[PDB]
Structures are given as structure tokens and as C-alpha cells.
């Protein structure tokens, strides 16, 4: 089976990756979100929806797990689906001005503020996507992100979490957090991921070095023909 | 049917998904190479070949189309394919260096010179993507290039080539040039592309904004689902 990560190791493999195999933060990011966009349409492909084109509300962090959650906007829009970003807190960084900007060219709306109601939400938007926090999590949810996930945890609607559900100890999960319905784990699954209890749970970024995956003995399966995306079940 | 476009239209739309689009080189670089990547998984499946994995020569050029060509070795040995890279003029640039790393420590072997023999190339690889100029071509092929494409022109295995079939005007192409057996239009096809006559012509780089399309009027296929690569025929 695969290697289920402590925050420890999963720290390790990302320093490795952009350290000793010198990856470029833009460049497994691109990955990551392409996989998460991936990931996404294959749970809860176009056609099995019943907007057309599906609505979608992507709420991106303070940090790297918000970019992905840009990078999974961008492919979302692209793979015919109709996201909607929210982005309260953006780093000035040419990263994240960037990834905002492609964005609002390729006209993704980024939302004034959160709709305050978990049913205004769910009216508008046919799934929502959790990018806040991710495996470096150890907060400390400040605010406006204890708030956000004060809605989300009432919605109808699906929550797809990028790595890691937003607010969960990374090891240890968290009872009374949000509950999604997909799950996509980066390089691999961190031990909160046995915690999970919704229906999809992918394994993305395809970019793990066979070297570094020995070295960790990450287990990973093989994923199929040229996917970037594997189910675990 | 999709637009041929001028090498002119070419550079402004490169230019516009830099400048206005803001994205950055890392980004469409990652996109792109996987796309080639995809394109020849496709093409020639590990499967269809008869060494188990199957052996690539990959030749880099000296600028971003070469880039294209170490991030697709670096895919294809995640697809299972054994690649070898010949990359003889390297700029001294972090963008460069970082994706040379990259592919040293996936244990993808650097060349220290061409094979001189089209016969050797034959018996040491089933197939030779050709990553050394793309769109922005107007020379004079310098050396090493004009050596190169000499042995390349005399090999049996089939070529693959990136964006451009390397030396032919990107434009009108060229009848004592290269002629590959895959092209892979990246964006959209260029007037060359018309005298193509390999067996395969992918189109690939699935980040063409829809406002930049119409704008150019591309006429750009769909895509299937998630797939970043379109068959042309
Ligand atoms: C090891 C690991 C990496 N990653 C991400 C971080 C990097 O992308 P980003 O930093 O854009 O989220 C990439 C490689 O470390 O994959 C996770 O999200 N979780 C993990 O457990
Ligand atoms: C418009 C266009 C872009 N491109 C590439 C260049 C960029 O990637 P790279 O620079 O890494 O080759 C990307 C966007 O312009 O797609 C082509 O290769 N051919 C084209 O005709």
C-alpha cells in the first residue's frame, strides 16, 4: 500500500524536491493544480452535472496551497467548467500577481467577499473547491479563514480539499472540521488521509523522482498511460 | 478548420501570453513539454515498441524549444520510456540549469557527443525527438545544429519533432530538410505545417486563453476531457 506521510517527511520530500532536484516552485505548482483540475473533472465530470457549464467556487490560502488552488481554477475553466475565485489574502509576491492576473484574463471572477450563507453558496456554485491550507499547516486558523470555514462546514454542495482538508491537524485530522467529498493528495497521502471519509480520493502530482520515491519508500502506485491522476480505493 | 500561422502572428501571440496574459516562461514551458510528452505516448506507446522500456534520444536545441525538449525527457521517463538527452549548447541560465539538474537526478543520461552514424543513433534508439529550433527560427543553422541534422536526416527510426521540424522556414518549411514522423504543433500550427507529411500531427499547449483564440481566431479544436494533446488529421 502507500506511504501515508508525517508533516516530517512530507517537509522533507518538498525541500528535496525544490532543493536537491532544484524544481522551480511555478513549475510543480502548475503540475499540482493541473492535477487537481484533473482530478476534479474526472469526479465530477461536466456532463454528470446539471449547470451547464458546472459552476465551481475556489477559495485559495494565504500560501502555496491557494496557488494550486489558481493553477485549478485556470484548468477548470479550461476543461469546461465555470470557476468563480475567492482570494482574500494574496501575497505581493510575482508569483501569486501572476497566477491573479492569468486569471482574470482568462475571465475567472475573484469574488468582493465570501457569501455569508452556506445556502447562497450552494445555489450558486455546483462544487467548491477548499485550497486554504495545506501540509505545512499548524495553525492558528486566523481569521478570515475561520469564518470561511465556519460556512463551508454547512454546505450541501461538495467540498474537493487540495492535499490536505483545510483545518485538520495534518497527522491527526480533526472531528469536528470540514468533511469533503474529494480528497486529492499531493506527491502523496499524509496521515490525516485516514481520517477521510468521502468518496474520492485521488493521488496527484506526477513528478515524483523514482529515486526520491525509493528513498522515502513512498509506495506509490503506478498511475495509468500518461494520467496525472490515480484513485486510491 | 484550426489556423497555420505566420511566423509574425506566432511571436505576437508568445508575446501577448507573456505580457498581457502574464504568465511566466517556467509555466508554459512545463505545459508545453508535457504536451510533447503526451503527443509521443500517444504516437508510440511503450507497448506498440519492442525494447521494454522503450529508448529516446532527445536534442536539445540552445533556447526555449530545447527547454520544451528536457521538460518532455523528463515526462516520457515518467511514462516509462527510457530517454537519453543530447544537449550541446546550454545557456548559463537558472531556467537551463534547474531543468538540467532535474533530469540528471531522474538518472536521465547527458550525451557528451552525437553518435556520428545515423546507423548507430538506429541501434541505440527507437526514437529521436527533435527539440532544436522552434517558431522564432530565421537562421542559419549554426554549428553543432547543421551536423546534427545531417545525421538526422539519414536515421530509419522515426522523429518526432517539436513545434517546427528543425531547419525548415517556419513558413514554407523545406524540401532537402528533416521529415519527421510526428510533429507537435504547440499552441497552434504554423504555415509549415502544411507540408508536413509524418504520419502524426498533434496539436498540443491546452493553456490557450479562449479571449486569445478569438482574438486570432485559431479556431482551435476541443480538446477530449482532460487530455492536453488533440490529433489532427
Ligand atoms: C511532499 C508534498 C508536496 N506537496 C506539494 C508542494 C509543492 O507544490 P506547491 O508548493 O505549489 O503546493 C509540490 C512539491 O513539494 O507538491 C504537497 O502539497 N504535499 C506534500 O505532502
Ligand atoms: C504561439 C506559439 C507558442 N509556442 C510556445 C512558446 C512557449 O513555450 P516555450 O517558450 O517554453 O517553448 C509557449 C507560449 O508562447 O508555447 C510555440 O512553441 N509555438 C508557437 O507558435
Request: charged fraction near 25%; avoid cysteine.
Given at each position: 500500500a502507500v506511504k501515508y506521510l508525517s508533516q516530517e517527511e512530507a517537509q522533507a520530500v518538498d525541500q528535496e524536491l525544490f532543493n536537491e532536484y532544484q524544481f522551480s516552485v511555478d513549475q510543480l505548482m502548475e503540475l499540482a493544480g493541473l492535477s487537481c483540475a484533473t482530478a476534479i473533472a474526472k469526479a465530477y465530470p461536466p456532463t454528470s452535472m446539471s449547470k451547464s457549464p458546472p459552476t465551481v467556487l475556489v477559495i485559495c490560502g494565504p500560501g502555496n496551497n491557494g496557488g494550486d488552488g489558481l493553477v485549478c481554477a485556470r484548468h477548470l475553466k479550461l476543461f469546461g467548467y465555470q470557476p468563480t475565485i475567492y482570494y482574500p489574502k494574496r501575497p505581493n509576491k510575482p508569483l501569486f500577481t501572476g497566477l491573479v492576473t492569468q486569471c482574470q484574463k482568462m475571465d475567472i471572477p475573484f469574488l468582493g467577499?465570501?457569501?455569508?450563507e452556506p445556502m447562497m453558496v450552494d445555489e450558486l456554485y455546483e462544487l467548491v473547491v477548499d485550497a486554504i491550507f495545506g501540509f505545512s499547516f499548524k495553525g492558528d486558523v486566523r481569521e478570515p479563514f475561520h469564518s470561511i470555514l465556519s460556512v463551508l462546514s454547512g454546505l450541501t454542495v461538495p467540498i474537493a480539499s487540495i492535499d490536505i482538508p483545510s483545518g485538520w491537524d495534518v497527522e491527526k485530522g480533526n472531528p469536528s472540521g470540514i468533511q469533503p467529498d474529494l480528497l486529492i493528495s499531493l506527491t502523496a497521502p499524509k496521515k490525516s488521509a485516514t481520517h477521510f471519509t468521502g468518496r474520492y480520493h485521488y493521488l496527484g502530482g506526477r513528478f515524483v523522482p523514482p529515486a526520491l520515491e525509493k528513498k522515502y519508500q513512498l509506495n506509490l502506485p503506478s498511475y495509468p498511460d500518461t494520467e496525472c491522476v490515480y484513485r486510491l480505493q
Open positions: 467577499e465570501m457569501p455569508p
